């Protein structure tokens, strides 16, 4: 396929937040948290939750998970450890409802 | 009215093909199973019209 | 033993062919069902 577009790049990146292990890999870092850039980028990616940008969101979870992380970066290892257990409890029910 | 008038037809044809597939078995069966395939696809089309 | 050779075997070869001809359709009947799920597509 030809060269990508920033719309599809940001779309696939925000849609990648639906995966739990990928968010776990993003939070278990040490370089992207030294400068206020990744936080401002995640807070910037909040335009997908509003129309007409919401008409292309395939996975409803990535948006709300984004609002959670943007809700948590305002106010280190331990909480990052805290979230995945709970989300793990939530996942399989939805998976059952999907197919 | 709509596609519901044709679905019946298609359904009625499916059995009519099955009988044929039963009555052949010889190496003629191949040709027949082709037609059967087409019928099934038609069914799928109408259901697509029932999605939205 | 030879007391022609080709004719006495082709019959049973054909009788062996027909059975396989009976068995070759079932696998296609199994593949069609797998081909129908791709065409099949509730709403939340």
């Amino acid at each position: 396929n030809p060269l990508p577009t920033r719309f599809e790049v940001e779309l696939e990146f925000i849609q990648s937040l639906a995966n739990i292990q990928y968010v776990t890999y993003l939070l278990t870092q040490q370089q992207i948290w030294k400068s206020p850039n990744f936080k401002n980028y995640l807070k910037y990616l909040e335009y997908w939750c509003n129309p007409p940008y919401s008409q292309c969101i395939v996975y409803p979870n990535c948006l709300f998970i984004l609002k959670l992380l943007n809700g948590f970066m305002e106010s280190x290892x331990x909480x990052x450890x805290x979230x995945x257990x709970x989300x793990x409890x939530x996942x399989x029910x939805x998976x059952x409802x999907x197919x | 009215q709509y596609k519901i008038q044709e679905l019946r037809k298609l359904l009625k044809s499916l059995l009519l093909n099955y009988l044929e597939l039963i009555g052949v078995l010889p190496d003629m069966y191949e040709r027949k199973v082709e037609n059967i395939r087409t019928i099934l696809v038609n069914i799928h089309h109408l259901l697509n019209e029932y999605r939205p | 033993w030879t007391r022609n050779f080709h004719v006495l075997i082709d019959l049973l070869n054909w009788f062996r062919t027909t059975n396989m001809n009976v068995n070759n359709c079932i696998w296609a009947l199994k593949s069609s069902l797998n081909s129908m799920t791709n065409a099949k597509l509730n709403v939340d």
């Binding site: 129309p51 008409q55 395939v58 996975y59 979870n61 | 999605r51 939205p52 | 509730n42 709403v43």
Partner: peptide
């Protein structure tokens, strides 16, 4: 509006989580 949900909610039934 409901018109966006009748055409947008149909694509939410086919979707496995991203890998």
């Amino acid at each position: 509006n409901s018109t966006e949900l009748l055409d947008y909610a149909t694509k939410l039934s086919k979707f496995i989580w991203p890998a």
